């Protein structure tokens, strides 16, 4: 008897895994590396695979930005 499974709630933790990775990786590869979303999303939980799409939304919608002037949240 250790860990009999014991991952019902854990999904909190599910996302902010898939989080930081679909951050990690939006950045990584918009901003400075061909990092492959793909295989990120081979080692992310499926349960939060549209969340590592919307992680990636929301980061795209900053990659948007990116280099020469980065984020403008501001209206013109």
């Known amino acids: ?3 009999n499974l014991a991952k019902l709630d854990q999904t909190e933790m ?3 895994n898939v989080d930081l990775a679909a951050a990690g990786v939006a950045f990584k590869e918009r901003y400075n590396m ?3 979303a793909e295989a990120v ?3 992310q939980p499926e349960h939060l695979r549209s ?3 919307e992680r990636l ?3 795209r919608l900053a ?3 990116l280099s020469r002037l980065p ?3 501001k209206l013109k």
Do not use: C, G, Q
């Open 1 to 3: 008897m250790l860990k």
């Open 14 to 16: 599910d996302k902010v």
């Open 34 to 36: 061909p990092v492959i």
């Open 41 to 43: 999303e081979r080692e």
């Open 51 to 53: 969340w590592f799409r």
């Open 57 to 59: 939304i929301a980061h």
């Open 63 to 65: 990659s948007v930005n």
């Open 71 to 73: 984020y403008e949240p």
